[PDB]
Ligand binder design. Sequence first.
Ligand SMILES: Nc1nc2c(ncn2C[C@@H](COCP(=O)(O)O)OC[C@@H](O)P(=O)(O)O)c(=O)[nH]1
Ligand SMILES: Nc1nc2c(ncn2C[C@@H](COCP(=O)(O)O)OC[C@@H](O)P(=O)(O)O)c(=O)[nH]1
Lengths: 178, 177
Amino acid sequence: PACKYDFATSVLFTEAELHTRMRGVAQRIADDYSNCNLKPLENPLVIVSVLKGSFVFTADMVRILGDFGVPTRVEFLRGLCDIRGKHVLVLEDILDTALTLREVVDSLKKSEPASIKTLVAIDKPGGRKIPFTAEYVVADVPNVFVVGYGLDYDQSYREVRDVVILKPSVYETWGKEE
Amino acid sequence: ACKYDFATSVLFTEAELHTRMRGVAQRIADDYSNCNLKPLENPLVIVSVLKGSFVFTADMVRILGDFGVPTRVEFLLCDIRGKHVLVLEDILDTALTLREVVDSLKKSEPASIKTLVAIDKPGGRKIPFTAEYVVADVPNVFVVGYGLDYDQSYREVRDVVILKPSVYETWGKELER
Ligand SMILES: Nc1nc2c(ncn2C[C@@H](COCP(=O)(O)O)OC[C@@H](O)P(=O)(O)O)c(=O)[nH]1
Ligand SMILES: Nc1nc2c(ncn2C[C@@H](COCP(=O)(O)O)OC[C@@H](O)P(=O)(O)O)c(=O)[nH]1
């Protein structure tokens, strides 16, 4: 068969596949935090959106979370104010070397929250520079460079609804920054 | 009878918004047809203003993609000189925010500037300002949902709703002793 995008070698996860998984994740999150007594305004779940591309994943997840009765409050680190004593769920579009999430988590602990967990959309477990495990993972991809669903190559292809493998010909031809 | 114990009524549903956003996307595609927009090289620079516009931005760029409009996003810049700029904002009221942003972006000499808002409140203007693209209009009422908040809450509400007056009153919890 052939690929749908002329800039991609293959499609790893469609928008439908992602959303389907995100409901399963949201179900578990709804169960885990059911004993935290989460309420809008009073005690909402503080969603920390790390990296610029995570705005697509964050926008979809919080609405799916809202369907499962989980009140949220967003902060963007693309912050560390008024999180003390509250629950913090760090959201990130992708995870491999785990260097980004590690520093953020260790930085949020300084403000001393009620709890802190991480939720990623795409996890590349074979890319770790340090040991790290996200409490919630939507999907796993091998060590290949992907774009779409917020993930970019030089600020492009974020708006792609599917997580696809970027063609090698694309990011070598665009190697013109010189 | 809307399914919201914290809202009195639903002004626009998620389905209604998306339907309108496709219609806007069709016009945006037609208008920027002579701009030669391509990924990487010359994409349409989306400038998302306000914190709660991330929901509207996330959906719109994907809908813009469906209609063949390549985009890159910046959140509120440099590297916009000579490039077409579309400024997105979740809501438009007094138009004090967009007026400042648009005028500030003009200093960087872009190819063109237009504005796209999801919810326009024409009767809330403190200064005159007209957006090129408007998804929906609402009268002078305070709304939440689709990125719009009340004290950082209710952004995750899929629909644009009017909060029940009991919400602010119960949230009158002034236990600051
Ligand atoms: N598109 C894409 N990006 C990747 C991929 N692998 C790593 N990255 C970079 C990532 C680093 O974060 C992970 P980590 O190493 O910190 O764990 O940062 C994203 C920034 O480009 P953004 O646009 O600001 O979000 C990948 O396969 N695809
Ligand atoms: N929820 C809600 N907010 C409104 C409404 N009218 C104005 N605002 C504030 C807006 C100001 O922008 C318009 P303007 O006066 O600049 O034209 O800014 C929003 C940031 O507070 P956010 O939470 O980061 O999105 C409304 O009906 N509902």
